[PDB]
């Protein structure tokens, strides 16, 4: 079971944070703050995760989104990460992302950034 | 604001079921049942979107969560959609999505399709 | 064989052209023209295809890049589209596309940007 | 001017082999080999860049596309790269990529595949 794998702190290669809690049933729920882009301070952030994962090997599928609104800021975005948890002592989150912003319907070819993160839990 | 118009049933191109309710602030939560793949009946879904979005006529961001895992099934895999809403007599969730599904590390470069979903009150 | 099938003029939702032509070898070569964006005029576009897809009903697979750079304009930038060509009565190329364009290092986790288009031989 | 920089042998994290020659007019023509997939020996490539591109420090835009047929094997598949170079000491290209292969109807919505991939002159 990698509920007390995937609980806790991680850090991406941009420096951003996820702080996240894996609920028994597969809920991830928790907290992200970005070091780039319109942001600052924390965002909620929820999603969920494979539970009872294969024992062959391979990562335990997940997903989170966060929209970017908070108390403090609001950038109309979202962004959902899409990847796997591979635990062990140099435990990961392999993650590919995409990051959409409201638009009016001319602009909505040009509403969508794509991207990937790598989160471990040092640095 | 976009609570009221978010808040409901929603079908996708591929005869899919989005079940959903819009919180005050900022939660998606409710059930997915998807058409195609490995996947039956109902599956939790979580996500955010944007509660205080622009008023130029720009969609609302959101994105949420399926983890493919229920009491009948399990496809060691999860779907994230990032999109925006846009409202009105024809409203449409307009999404695309990243599909990673669990993998060892050796075929880790082969573990996330992409796609996109066009989602309506009707069909 | 699908040379004869993709050769000649497409259309895109947006109302882009896209004007090919499938060498035997398996090459892509021709011009693009964007009704959006950083563009006018047309651009030089060159791609590949399987010249030799399965008979068993599915698509042959396909891509092509264009720089959108030409004797007008410069939006220092690249789209890439990946699909899958469909003939018959109402034939069509399904695709994704990645748009990225040049950033500094700070910027470049904001340097891609992705969507889908679907090319007709009619519109 | 990044011809110069671009031409010549590269290397990504899979231990992947792109041979790339750059033409004073935007054009990318040369090879690929992969080290995963349905994949063995070399693949014709072409693509294109930004012959001119900003000088402020940003990344030269640039895709190219592998259709996966060569003698030895027809994977029914096609590659898009995106992304851009950023030259010097440690030059690299920092890619995404879309994988589509053929299906049918049914199956397209799993039809790509999308990943990144960074390229080095060295490994
Ligand atoms: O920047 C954000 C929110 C923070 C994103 C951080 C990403 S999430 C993926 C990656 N991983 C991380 O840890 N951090 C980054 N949203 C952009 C929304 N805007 C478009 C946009 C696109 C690129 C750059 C700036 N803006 C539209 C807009 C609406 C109102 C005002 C201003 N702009
Ligand atoms: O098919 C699913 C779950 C349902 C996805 C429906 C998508 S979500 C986006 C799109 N929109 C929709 O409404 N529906 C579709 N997961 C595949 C996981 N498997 C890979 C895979 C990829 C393609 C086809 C089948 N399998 C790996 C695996 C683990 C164990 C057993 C079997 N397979
Ligand atoms: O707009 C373009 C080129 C045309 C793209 C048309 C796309 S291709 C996919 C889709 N399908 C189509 O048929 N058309 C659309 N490049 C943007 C490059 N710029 C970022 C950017 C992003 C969004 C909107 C405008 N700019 C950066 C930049 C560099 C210098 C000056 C100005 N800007
Ligand atoms: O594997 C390939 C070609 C090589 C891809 C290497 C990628 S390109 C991006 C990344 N970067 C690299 O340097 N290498 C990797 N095509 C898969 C086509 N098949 C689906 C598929 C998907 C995943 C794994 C295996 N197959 C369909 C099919 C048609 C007939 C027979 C068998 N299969
Ligand atoms: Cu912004
Ligand atoms: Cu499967
Ligand atoms: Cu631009
Ligand atoms: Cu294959």
Do not use: C, M
């Not at 403090?72 to 635990?87: F, K, L, P």
């Not at 002592?89 to 992302?97: F, L």
């Amino acid at each position: 079971r990698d509920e007390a794998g995937i609980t806790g702190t991680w850090y991406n290669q941009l420096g951003s944070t996820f702080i996240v809690t894996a609920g028994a049933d597969g809920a991830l729920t928790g907290t992200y703050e970005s070091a780039v882009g319109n942001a600052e301070s924390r965002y909620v952030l929820t999603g969920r995760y494979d539970s009872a994962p294969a024992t062959d090997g391979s990562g335990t599928a997940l997903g989170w989104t966060v929209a970017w609104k908070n108390n403090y800021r609001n950038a109309h975005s979202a962004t959902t990460w899409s990847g796997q948890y591979v635990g062990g002592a140099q435990a990961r989150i392999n993650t590919q992302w995409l990051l959409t912003f409201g638009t009016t319907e001319a602009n909505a070819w040009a509403s969508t950034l794509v991207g990937h993160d790598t989160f471990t839990k040092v640095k």
